From Swiss-Prot, chain B:
Belongs to the peptidase T1A family. The gene is PSMA5. It comes from Homo sapiens (Human). This is Proteasome subunit alpha type-5. GO terms for cellular component: cytoplasm; cytosol; extracellular exosome; extracellular region; ficolin-1-rich granule lumen; nucleoplasm; nucleus; proteasome complex. The keyword tRNA processing does not apply.
Curated annotation (Swiss-Prot), chain C:
Sumoylated by UBE2I in response to MEKK1-mediated stimuli. This is 26S proteasome regulatory subunit 6A. It is found in: Cytoplasm; Nucleus. GO terms for molecular function: ATP binding; ATP hydrolysis activity; identical protein binding; proteasome-activating activity. GO terms for cellular component: cytosol; extracellular region; ficolin-1-rich granule lumen; membrane; nucleoplasm; nucleus; P-body; proteasome accessory complex. Its main location: cytoplasm. Transmembrane segments: none annotated. The chain holds residues 177 to 439 of 439 of the full protein. Belongs to the AAA ATPase family. Component of the 19S proteasome regulatory particle complex. The 26S proteasome consists of a 20S core particle (CP) and two 19S regulatory subunits (RP). The regulatory particle is made of a lid composed of 9 subunits, a base containing 6 ATPases including PSMC3 and few additional components. Interacts with PAAF1. (Microbial infection) Interacts with HIV-1 Tat. It is linked to Deafness, cataract, impaired intellectual development, and polyneuropathy: An autosomal recessive disease characterized by early onset of deafness, cataract, severe developmental delay, and severely impaired intellectual development. Patients later develop polyneuropathy of the lower extremities, associated with depigmentation of the hair in that area. The lineage of its organism: Eukaryota, Metazoa, Chordata, Craniata, Vertebrata. The modification Phosphoserine is found at S190. ATP binds at G51, P52, P53, G54, T55, G56, K57, T58.
Curated annotation (Swiss-Prot), chain D:
It is found in: Cytoplasm; Nucleus. Belongs to the AAA ATPase family. This is 26S proteasome regulatory subunit 6B. The modification N6-acetyllysine is found at K115, K119. Component of the 19S proteasome regulatory particle complex. The 26S proteasome consists of a 20S core particle (CP) and two 19S regulatory subunits (RP). The regulatory particle is made of a lid composed of 9 subunits, a base containing 6 ATPases including PSMC4 and few additional components. Interacts with NR1I3. Interacts with PAAF1. Interacts with TRIM5. Interacts with ZFAND1. Component of the 26S proteasome, a multiprotein complex involved in the ATP-dependent degradation of ubiquitinated proteins. This complex plays a key role in the maintenance of protein homeostasis by removing misfolded or damaged proteins, which could impair cellular functions, and by removing proteins whose functions are no longer required. Therefore, the proteasome participates in numerous cellular processes, including cell cycle progression, apoptosis, or DNA damage repair. It comes from the Eukaryota. The chain holds residues 280 to 418 of 418 of the full protein. It comes from Homo sapiens.
Swiss-Prot record, chain H:
This is 26S proteasome regulatory subunit 10B. The chain holds residues 196 to 379 of 389 of the full protein. Component of the 26S proteasome, a multiprotein complex involved in the ATP-dependent degradation of ubiquitinated proteins. This complex plays a key role in the maintenance of protein homeostasis by removing misfolded or damaged proteins, which could impair cellular functions, and by removing proteins whose functions are no longer required. Therefore, the proteasome participates in numerous cellular processes, including cell cycle progression, apoptosis, or DNA damage repair. Belongs to the AAA ATPase family. It comes from the Eukaryota.
Length: 199, 238, 253, 136, 240, 397, 144, 184
């Protein structure tokens, strides 16, 4: 009853710090059956282990980088900066998104597909190379559409966030994309994105 | 909270128990074990010594005493309490031999010792008497008109005729062993052998001359304690 | 803070007048607060109810809570005598507030409790001051079950504080009969049993004494060798009950 | 623990007042109603050099108290009231005067005199025994 | 502790009781059951003798005090023995001074008066022994049940001790037949009541039971294992 | 695991009269110490060995960065990510780099993390915070069983508890009795409990950890139990080891319902100590020794047979033990022939080992008072009541 | 993580206590569904948005802490003594409903849902259950 | 500041006097404030040197109150009310003037005071025909305030036993009877 007790005190130190938020350049896709996500220009598949399809079906979807243009040809890719350019890629369709999720600057290259043939050449993982392909870039309805023939149709649409940059004339840019270095399991990949414009 | 009732002999538990007398009962187990066996040819008492020093004179430790030539006693509990009880027993026997010039039944001996007991909560203690329960368990043996008779007396004043009873420190185990050992056709010699065996398997130390006191009562002779040579004789066979 | 005490009034028995009084003390004013405001009077905030410890003062409280389907608080008197200061300094206040936000609620304080010696003073003072310190409309009611009516603080038993009064008498033979037949409703008991004989053989056996006798008849039918729940285990139960332990003490004649 | 902590406070007070590191030009004043219960270590020279007793006003002191509290009083036999033997402190005198003023306010007269001043005097020093006569 | 009101017989409970008295009442329950019956002309006390060990005789529960009055104990050996000794002295003095046997009603009233003093006065413990008195007087046989609360009752039959409720309800059931039985049927009824007290695993053997019978021309005599033997031949089998 | 510790030099202590047998033995020891010094100074004089791998180590260091913070690996996840707590108390879900020893990762071992973007980049098996490093005995105390007088039963028990399992233990499992995990010495102050602990730490073959009991309690939240855990982890790591916690009642008091935060933390620290005591099997080669004066005030769970089986009693010295202690402490004195020392022992008192040591010291001081060093019997006569400060006379006779 | 704030797909925020650091009301990352997040589970979150990025179940393994660490105890009915009435009661508790469910079923009585074993420490209680745990043909669980 | 003294005593050693200091500091900050310290007998219960810890802490709290009340810092525009049921156990230092200059005996109601209580508390209740205070006053001697109000309360409750919408003289009569019986 006659307790009347004193009291001690044990403090707990507390502190933390938000680091420099790290940009993860990750692409996601569910083209045929697998929710594959890859980090990356060295390529490494995060989830969606050894792909049921070949890598090439998705190698064409890979801001911050743009093709090399001469001084004669207006470089819509370049002057669209600092914001960059958002494109719609039709193969299966591909779109690039910039989001702020969590503490990672997400440069999504979100992939999606359908109409996978039961014996199509894209899933047996056979692959020789991608021969140099010329994209004819021209303006249809205020959107920079690039028509390219796939050799191993592409209906690329490029829109700048700065909707004031003048549209370049219809030219023919030669892309040469090939899977430089990889592994058999295709989990440690190095990609090539060389491409130069030609009038 | 039991504690409010163990203070005083005149208190009733919620279960109506006598905690003070139960503690007196437990006080027996502090004493040494005493075994009495009853058979047709007589009654025999075996008691340990629980000697503390070899210098202790054996006669001074009195774990068996004779109330009368025909009746023998064993006690387990407070030695002064036991001596008062035993002196009262001898006085009451002499009283009966004065009034009736006859030797009483051992049942009457336990009756009168019981009236000396269970007087703790009696108003007759005005001149001076026990204000607490007696602290010794008793074992009466003898031979009367009913042949051999053995009784066990509880400090609360309870008395029971027994064919064989073990009290004291090792009461429970010794009683359990005798329960299987005992046969109603026990002879005196085999009874004493069984008692010494029970002591051997119950005693803390080896059975020698100076650890066991032994007494016998038969209809023919009187109370007889085994002398040094006699106890040596009864111990050489075992 | 249980919300469903799971009673239909079909579980408790022998308190017909008690349940009627309790209903008209709590739920009838709660249901008919309009009729009370018509009377130009304040409905009772406090219902003090008392009885022995074996008369199930909580099973009726749970029955009331289930009937009124409201939130059910529960506080214990012997819980409060220890834990020194804080008995109502941060407990009764918080409990009453918990009732307030989680409406409708039926606060419960069980057991008598004494109603050095200075902490219980603040306990009852906070009890009274915050039972008064609340909304007059009285959306939430309080049931106070005590084991005796010997200690009575006039401020607490006064009007407004604890107006209604409920008494729990000695349960009778019919109360027993109904209570073991209710407790054995989940039993595959043959009708050969004489619940009336058991009830008349359950003298002094109030309430909680069933729990003992009825469920121990159950586990004795288990102990009987999986025998059907006939009298053959039930009379053994009534003989065992709280006296099942045999002291087996000597020095008794 | 509680008594130990209180005695720790007292010991710290002692060791600070007259401990190892002596203080300079730091005069302490401590007031108490029951000096006889103080620790002797606090009641020794070097710690409490002077133990001044403040007894109840005695006659002349009572007159001084009445005068100095009646300076703010109204014009209004204060000398006889002083002469009356009553063990009353300066607080009681201040009471008496304040109560006299309060009663005069009640009766709506701005100068107290024998009636209300005497009534206040009775009200203040009640000392009503209510004592069973078998004690005396 | 809110139970400071039960330490002595001189303090009333807050609700108006002497909890020491109730404790004494509960005390006798620890004793073995014992049932008393009375005929038109004879009175019988049947007690379950309980032994501390099977290596010893059973505790007696049928004390004889007078050729017309016998008693049966349930509870403390000390209190019961003091009561029995006081009975024997009282009967001795009554025969010495009056030359007539002690009336049962006066004997029981003297019991009430004697055991009330410990209940009322500080000192000696309350007499915590339930006594069954089977006596004979002008109105025939009398059965008295004296409770440790210094109270006594006149009952047609009585079972006091361990698990006495079974025999109580047995006698309630057999109320209708008691007054017209002779010795055999009433002895069997008492034996059956004791069997009701006893659980199934135990039976009323020779060493287990003690019977004392008194009457108009037959003195109160207590039977033993050999003597009880005829009375247990008429006993039937346990209805199990 | 690693091996034990507490290196000590030669006992010497065979001569004491300073008869150059001491000088010869000490000169031999000094010569060996000189060869130590010269050998290592020569080895550092010429020892060219470095670089070799270099580049891979350089790039792994670049990957690790600078500085690197150490944390406690509280839990592990799939073998690329883990849960690591900084010394502040915050723990994070971090990644595990390839160059870490996945076998070494266990709950508890200190992990080197990256300062920015925390990630397990190393493992430190020798964290051993400065406090627990201090509690580990380095220099064995000079006292030994020769210096202990009496307490032969106590010495026997302590050796049967902490030495016999350390030395040949086959008797233990041969009888099948588990070795006594932990022993508590107790008794009145200055009986020799701490002295016996010193003697054990002298004649030892295991890591001896000295603790104060009150040392374990730490201000910051969770620092107490963390330090206790670190102490016992060091004990296991350097097993066999002996953990001596003097004055166990600094925390061993009866456990009661805590109210304030500090008392809750004390309860947590004792709970962690009890948990660590239960954690290691008695078959393990780590034993604890706890000494106290107020044995009656200890929690009756710390001294459970399942936790601390033994309970060594240190009673006040008997007359023979008193004379033994007097002989021991008077060994270095130059006593005269008049002294007897028997009168002091025969006096019925409550002298202790500390009391006898103080009596000897005060007798020496009294002799120094008279400008002498031979110390008469009168010096002891005065000293006895000089140091023994503080039944009503003829009541008992 | 703490109270769910009754999300229902429109208020998915939860208040989470980061240890001795503060507590924040935050939302989910796109990679976790609300079904994986519930009150009282450890969650790994980012550092500026504090979005719950991945639930972190504490895992179960006898290696950590102490656990049942037993399936068929080696203590048999011959290894227990002094609790004959207690072991009999325990038998009625566990062996009769488990290995003889038919008698409880046809008796129409719910088997004993809960039983408590109270006594002074060191009486033997634990191993007694362990003993029946060997003879009940069921795995023993020790939780401290 | 409605303060009850029994609610400020704490096991925490220096917290009760701290609470008193906070109360008076609040009063000084928020003039004009009224300090109503109910049940002051639970704080100022005379100073004695028996030495038990609890009563010693009580003395410390009492002297903290005495300082906060007539201490060094003179009080302006703050008036205190202290109610107790045992005035005779108050400390003489607290009882002295300057602190408690008036002692007001709010005693048991007299017959006139009783009837005043009934008539004032009779307001909210609706009366049908006739209700007399005098009979209730005669039949309720020894009553003090709240109990009288109790008489009204259950009377309305009585009105629900036979399901009225009003009160009657018999209603009040049996109500005061029940109140008196409960008071025994
Ligand atoms: N048996 C002994 N023989 C010789 N010296 C002893 C003996 N016992 C104690 N001493 C002396 O007592 C001194 C103090 O003893 P120690 O530090 O062991 O005390 P302790 O009994 O552990 O007490 P505490 O823990 O209360 O401080 C030792 O330095 C030693 O000189
Ligand atoms: N009519 C009844 N129906 C169901 N249970 C009852 C009834 N009467 C009594 N009980 C029993 O009483 C017990 C509760 O006792 P309770 O009255 O709460 O004691 P107390 O008044 O001391 O707090 C429960 O075990 C319950 O089964
Ligand atoms: N009935 C028993 N049979 C066998 N050993 C027992 C028994 N009771 C206690 N013990 C012994 O007691 C020790 C501790 O028992 P334990 O089960 O840990 O106690 P608790 O019941 O408090 O957990 C065991 O090592 C065991 O050897
Ligand atoms: Mg020491």
């Amino acid at each position: 009853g006659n307790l009347l007790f004193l009291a001690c005190y044990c403090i707990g130190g507390m502190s933390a710090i938000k680091p420099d938020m790290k940009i993860k350049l990750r692409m996601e896709g569910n083209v045929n059956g697998h929710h594959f996500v890859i980090d990356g220009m060295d390529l490494e598949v995060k989830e969606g282990g050894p792909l049921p399809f070949a890598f090439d079906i998705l190698t064409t979807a890979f801001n911050r980088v743009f093709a090399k243009y001469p001084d004669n040809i207006q470089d819509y890719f370049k002057q669209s900066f600092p914001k960059g350019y958002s494109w719609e890629r039709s193969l299966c369709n591909a779109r690039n998104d910039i989001t702020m999720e969590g503490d990672t600057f997400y440069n999504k290259v979100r992939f999606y597909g359908t109409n996978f043939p039961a014996n199509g050449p894209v899933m047996q993982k056979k692959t020789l190379k991608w021969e140099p392909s010329t994209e004819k870039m021209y303006v249809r309805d205020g959107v920079l559409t690039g028509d390219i023939e796939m050799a191993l149709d592409f209906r690329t649409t490029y829109k700048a966030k700065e909707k004031g940059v003048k549209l370049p004339g219809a030219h023919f840019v030669d892309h040469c994309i090939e899977i430089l270095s990889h592994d058999k399991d295709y989990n440690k990949v190095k990609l090539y994105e060389h491409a130069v414009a030609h009038s | 909270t039991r504690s409010e009732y163990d203070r005083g002999v005149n208190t009733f538990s919620p279960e109506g128990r006598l905690f003070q007398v139960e503690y007196a009962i437990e006080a027996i187990k502090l004493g040494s074990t005493a075994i009495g066996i009853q058979t047709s040819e007589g009654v025999c008492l075996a008691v340990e010594k629980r000697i503390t020093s070899p210098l202790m004179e054996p006669s001074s430790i009195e774990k068996i005493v004779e109330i009368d030539a025909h009746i023998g006693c064993a006690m387990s509990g407070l030695i002064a309490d036991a001596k008062t009880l035993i002196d009262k027993a001898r006085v009451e026997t002499q009283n009966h031999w004065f009034t009736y010039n006859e030797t009483m039944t051992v049942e009457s001996v336990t009756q009168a010792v019981s009236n000396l007991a269970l007087q703790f909560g009696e108003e007759d203690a005005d001149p001076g008497a026990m204000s607490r329960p007696f602290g010794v368990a008793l074992l009466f043996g003898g031979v009367d008109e009913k042949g051999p008779q053995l009784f066990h007396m509880d400090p609360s004043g309870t008395f029971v005729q027994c064919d064989a009873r073990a009290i004291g420190s090792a009461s429970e185990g010794a009683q359990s062993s005798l329960q299987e050992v005992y046969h109603k056709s026990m002879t005196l010699k085999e009874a004493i052998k069984s008692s010494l065996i029970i002591l051997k398997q119950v005693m803390e130390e080896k059975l020698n001359a100076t650890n066991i006191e032994l007494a016998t009562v038969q209809p023919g002779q009187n109370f007889h304690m085994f002398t040094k040579e006699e106890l040596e004789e009864v111990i050489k066979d075992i | 803070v249980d919300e469903r005490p799971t009673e239909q009034y079909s579980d408790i028995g022998g308190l017909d007048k008690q349940i009627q009084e309790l209903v008209e003390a709590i739920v009838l004013p709660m249901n008919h607060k309009e009729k009370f405001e018509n009377l130009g009077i304040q409905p009772p905030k406090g219902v003090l109810m008392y009885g022995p410890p074996g008369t199930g003062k909580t099973l009726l409280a749970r029955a009331c809570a289930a009937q009124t389907k409201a939130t059910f608080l529960k506080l214990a008197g012997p819980q409060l005598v220890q834990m020194f200061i804080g008995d109502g300094a941060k407990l009764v206040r918080d409990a009453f507030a918990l009732a307030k936000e989680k409406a409708p609620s039926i606060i419960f304080i069980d057991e008598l409790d004494a109603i050095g010696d200075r902490e219980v003073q603040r306990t009852m003072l906070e009890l009274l001051n915050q039972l008064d310190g609340f909304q007059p409309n009285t959306q939430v009611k309080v049931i106070a079950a005590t084991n005796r009516v010997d200690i009575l603080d006039p401020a607490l038993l006064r009007s407004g504080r604890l107006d209604r009064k409920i008494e729990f008498p000695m349960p009778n033979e019919e109360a027993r009969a109904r209570i073991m037949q209710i407790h054995s409703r989940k039993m595959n008991v043959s009708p050969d049993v004489n619940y009336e004989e058991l009830a008349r053989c359950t003298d002094d056996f109030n309430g909680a004494q069933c729990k003992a006798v009825c469920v121990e008849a159950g586990m004795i039918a288990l102990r009987r060798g999986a025998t059907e729940l006939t009298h053959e285990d039930y009379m053994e139960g009534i003989l065992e009950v709280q006296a099942k332990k045999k002291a087996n003490l000597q020095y008794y004649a | 623990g509680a008594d130990r902590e209180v005695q720790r406070i007292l010991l710290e007070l002692l060791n600070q007042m007259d401990g190892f590191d002596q203080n300079v030009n730091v005069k302490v004043i401590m007031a108490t109603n029951r000096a006889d219960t103080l620790d002797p270590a606090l009641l020794r020279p070097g710690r409490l050099d002077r133990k001044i007793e403040f007894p109840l006003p005695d006659r002349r002191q009572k007159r001084l108290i009445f005068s100095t509290i009646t300076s703010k009083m109204n014009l209004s036999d204060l000398e006889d009231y002083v002469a009356r033997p009553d063990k009353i402190s300066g607080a009681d005198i201040n009471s008496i005067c304040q109560e006299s003023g309060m009663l005069a306010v009640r009766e709506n007269r701005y100068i107290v005199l024998a009636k209300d001043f005497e009534k206040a005097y009775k009200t203040v020093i009640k000392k009503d025994e209510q004592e069973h006569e078998f004690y005396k | 502790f809110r139970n400071q009101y039960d330490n002595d017989v001189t303090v009333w409970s807050p609700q108006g009781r002497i909890h020491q008295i109730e404790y004494a009442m509960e005390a006798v329950k620890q004793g073995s059951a014992t049932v008393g019956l009375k005929s038109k002309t004879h009175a019988v006390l049947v007690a379950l003798k309980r032994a501390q060990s099977e290596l010893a005789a059973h505790q007696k529960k049928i004390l004889h005090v007078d050729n017309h009055i016998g008693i049966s104990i349930a509870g403390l050996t000390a209190d019961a023995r003091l009561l029995c000794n006081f009975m024997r002295q009282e009967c001795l003095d009554s025969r010495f001074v009056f030359d007539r046997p002690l009336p049962v009603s006066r004997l029981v009233s003297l019991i009430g008066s004697k055991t009330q003093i410990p209940t009322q006065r500080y000192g000696r413990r309350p007499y915590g022994v339930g006594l069954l008195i089977a006596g004979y007087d002008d109105m025939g046989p009398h059965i008295f049940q004296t409770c440790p609360s210094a109270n006594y009752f006149d009952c047609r039959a009585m079972s006091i001790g361990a698990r006495s409720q079974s025999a109580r309800t047995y006698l309630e059931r057999h109320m209708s037949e008691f007054m017209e039985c002779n010795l055999n049927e009433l002895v069997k009824h008492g034996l059956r009541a004791l069997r009701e007290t006893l659980p199934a695993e135990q039976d009323l053997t020779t060493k287990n039971v003690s019977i004392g019978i008194v009457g108009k021309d037959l003195e109160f005599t207590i039977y033993d294992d050999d003597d009880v033997s005829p009375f247990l031949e008429g006993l039937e089998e346990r209805p199990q | 695991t690693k091996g034990p510790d507490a290196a000590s030099k030669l006992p010497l202590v065979t001569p004491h009269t300073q008869c150059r047998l001491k000088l010869l033995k000490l000169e031999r020891i000094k010569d060996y110490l000189l060869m130590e010094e010269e050998f290592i100074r020569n080895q550092e004089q010429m020892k060219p060995l470095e670089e070799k791998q270099e580049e891979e180590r350089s790039k792994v260091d670049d990957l690790r960065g600078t500085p690197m913070s150490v944390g406690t690996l509280e839990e592990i996840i799939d073998d690329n990510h883990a849960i690591v707590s900084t010394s502040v108390g915050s723990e994070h879900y971090v990644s595990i780099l390839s160059f870490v020893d996945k076998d070494l990762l266990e709950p508890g071992c200190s992990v080197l993390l990256n300062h920015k973007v925390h990630a397990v980049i190393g493992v430190l098996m020798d964290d051993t915070d400065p406090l627990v490093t201090v509690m580990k005995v380095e220099k064995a105390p000079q006292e030994t069983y020769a210096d202990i007088g009496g307490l032969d039963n106590q010495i026997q028990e302590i050796k049967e508890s902490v030495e016999l399992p350390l030395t040949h233990p086959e008797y233990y499992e041969e009888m099948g009795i588990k070795p006594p995990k932990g022993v508590i010495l107790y008794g009145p102050p200055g009986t020799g409990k701490t002295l016996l602990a010193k003697a054990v730490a002298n004649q030892t073959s295991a890591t001896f950890l000295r603790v104060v009991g009150s040392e374990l309690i730490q201000k910051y939240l969770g620092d107490g139990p963390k330090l206790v855990r670190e102490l016992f982890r060091v004990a296991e790591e350097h097993a066999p080891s002996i953990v001596f916690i003097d004055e166990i009642d600094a925390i061993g008091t009866k456990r009661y319902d805590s109210n304030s935060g500090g008392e809750r933390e004390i309860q947590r620290t004792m709970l962690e100590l009890l948990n660590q005591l239960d954690g290691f099997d008695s078959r393990g080669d780590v034993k604890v020794i706890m000494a106290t004066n107020r044995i009656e005030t200890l929690d009756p769970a710390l001294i459970r047979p399942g936790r601390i089986d033994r309970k060594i009693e240190f009673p006040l010295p008997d007359e023979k033990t008193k004379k033994r202690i007097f002989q021991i402490h008077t060994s270095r004195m130059t006593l005269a022939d008049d002294v007897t020392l028997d009168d002091l022992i025969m006096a019925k008192d409550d002298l202790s080992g500390a009391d006898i040591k103080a009596i000897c010291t005060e007798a020496g001081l009294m002799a120094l008072r008279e400008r002498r060093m031979k110390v008469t019997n009168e010096d002891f006569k005065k000293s006895k009541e000089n140091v023994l400060y503080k039944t009503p006379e003829g009541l008992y006779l | 993580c703490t109270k769910i704030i009754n999300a229902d797909s429109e208020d998915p925020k939860y208040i989470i206590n980061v240890k001795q650091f503060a507590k924040f009301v935050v939302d989910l990352s796109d990679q976790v569904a609300p079904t994986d997040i519930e009150e009282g589970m450890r969650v790994g979150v980012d550092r500026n948005k504090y979005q719950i990025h991945i639930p972190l179940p504490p895992k179960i393994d006898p290696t950590v802490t102490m656990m049942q660490v037993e399936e068929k105890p080696d203590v048999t009915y011959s290894d227990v003594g002094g609790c004959k009435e207690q072991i009999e009661k325990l038998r009625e508790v566990v062996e009769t409903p488990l290995l003889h469910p038919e008698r409880f079923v046809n008796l129409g009585i719910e088997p004993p849902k809960g039983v408590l074993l109270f006594g002074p420490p060191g009486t033997g209680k634990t191993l007694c259950a362990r003993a029946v745990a060997n003879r009940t043909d069921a795995c023993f669980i020790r939780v401290i | 500041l409605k303060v009850v003294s029994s609610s400020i005593v704490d096991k925490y050693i220096g917290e009760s006097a701290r609470l008193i200091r906070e109360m008076f500091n609040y009063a000084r900050d928020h003039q004009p404030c009224i300090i109503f310290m109910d049940e002051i007998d639970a704080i100022g219960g005379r100073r004695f040197s028996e030495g038990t810890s609890a009563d010693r802490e009580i003395q410390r709290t009492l002297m903290e109150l005495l300082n906060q009340m007539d201490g060094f810092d003179t009080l302006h525009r703050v008036k205190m009310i202290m109610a107790t049921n045992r005035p005779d156990t108050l400390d003489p230092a607290l009882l002295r003037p300057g602190r408690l200059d008036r002692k007001i005996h709010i005693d048991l109601p007299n017959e006139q005071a009783r009837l005043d209580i009934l008539k004032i508390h009779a307001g909210p209740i609706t009366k049908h025909g006739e209700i007399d205070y005098e009979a209730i006053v005669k039949l309720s001697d020894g009553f003090n305030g709240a109990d009288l109000r109790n008489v009204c309360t259950e009377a309305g409750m009585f009105a629900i036993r036979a399901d009225h919408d009003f009160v009657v003289q018999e209603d009040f009569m049996k109500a005061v009877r029940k109140v008196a019986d409960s008071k025994k």
